[PDB]
Structure formats: C-alpha cells, structure tokens
Amino acid sequence: MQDAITSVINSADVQGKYLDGSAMDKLKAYFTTGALRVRAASTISANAAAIVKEAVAKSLLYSDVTRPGGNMYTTRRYAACIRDLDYYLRYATYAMLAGDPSILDERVLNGLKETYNSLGVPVGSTVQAIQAMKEVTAGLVGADAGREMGVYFDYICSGLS
Amino acid sequence: GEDTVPYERYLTPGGYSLRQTRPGALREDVGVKVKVEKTARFIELGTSST
C-alpha cells in the first residue's frame, strides 16, 4: 500500500539518494493531477449504487447467468455479486486517489483468482461486468478522469484474467 | 369418353354442407379464424438458457 509519493520516496530510499529532479518532476505531476483525482473521487462516491446497477443492467442482466443454472442465480448470489462489484468500484476509486495500483494487487488481486476458481465464479463474465462499470464511470466523470479510472479497472481485469 | 366409368364430379352445396361440416369431418379454420398457440412468455423466460 503506497501512493505515487510513497513509491517515489521508496525508490529514492532504496537508492539511498536524495530526491533529484526526476523525482521532483514526478511529484509535480502527481500534485497537478491530484485535484482532478479528488473531484472524480467525489463524483464516484456520489453514484456508487447507480454505477453498479447500470453495470449489471448493461452486462449481466437478462443473460444466462441470472437464469437458473447461472452463478448469479439466487438472491444470495445476486447480493454477493453486487457486493463484489461494489468492492471493485471502491478499490478502483482508492487506486485512482493514490495514483498507484499497489492497493489493488495487495488487497483485491491477492487471492481473488483462486477464490473465484474454487467457488465456480465465471471470470469472463465478471471481467465484462468490470468493463461495463468502467464504461459507465468514464461516461460519468469525463474523458481524462475516466481514463485514469480505466487504467486501474484494466489493472483489475488483467489481474483477474 | 369411352374409356372410363363415370364418377361423382360435382356436389350441391347441400350435399357438401352435409358431409364436410359434420364435426368429425370438420377442420378448424372453416368459418372463423383460429389464434396462434404459443406457450406463455413467463415459462419461456424461466428456462435455463436462451
């Protein structure tokens, strides 16, 4: 768990060197993008349940997975699916605020593949659900904030696949 | 024309009305429409795959 600042400090410390001009430029880049990160995080905190339910309405609804036999069939499985998608959106917001995806592979992508493979959860359908969540939130917060959200959404989909 | 024995070529509407519109001889389009017989859409939606 480290943001862009802590990773820059960790690189300069593992070097043992002081903060040179490249580290200063990286921190200036983060300190310019931080206000946009803050406003996108507020806008995403506004519409958590709406983004999640629009992602299910785009991908998972009216398909086979909500029908009998699907892994999203029962009300318990539906509630756990909404819970999993809320987790993905919340941690993508955290990784957007930090500017570093270390929290994603520390706390989402750690044992997620083995959990989903033990439960029988389809990984492709949940990857499509995360992609539709990314599409909806990029329609919500704009072009560049949607892109800096979608880089961590693509990180979650890549670590899941 | 000197090769075939005759055969009943024409009926009156009385005789045809006698034989065909009897209930066992009847079809089911003959006089009013029949609607289409689909299954219920909630049964079709409740199956296990498209």
List CB contacts (< 8 A) between B48 and chain A: 64, 67-69
For A71, the closest chain B residue by CA position comes to B48
Chain position carrying tokens 């005759």: B6
Resolution at which this structure was determined, Å: 3.5
DSSP reduced 3-state for A142? coil
Q: Is residue A157 marked as binding?
A: no
Cα A137 from Cα A42, distance rounded (Å): 12
Cα A8 from Cα A23, distance rounded (Å): 6
The number of residues making up chain A comes to 161
CB A152 within 8 A of CB A109: no
Nearest partner of A96 among A49, A50, A47, A33, judged by Cα = A33
Q: How far is CA B15 from the centre of its chain?
A: 18
- Asked if the C-beta of A64 comes within 8 angstroms of chain B's C-beta atoms, the answer is yes
For B49, the closest chain A residue by CA position comes to A64
Cα A104 from Cα A82, distance rounded (Å): 19
Mutate to test the interface with B, among A61, A64, A65, A73 (most CBs of B within 10 A): A64
- Asked if the C-beta of A61 comes within 8 angstroms of chain B's C-beta atoms, the answer is no
Q: How was this structure determined?
A: cryo-EM
Kindly calculate the radius of gyration of chain B based on its CA atoms and give it in whole angstroms. Answer: 22
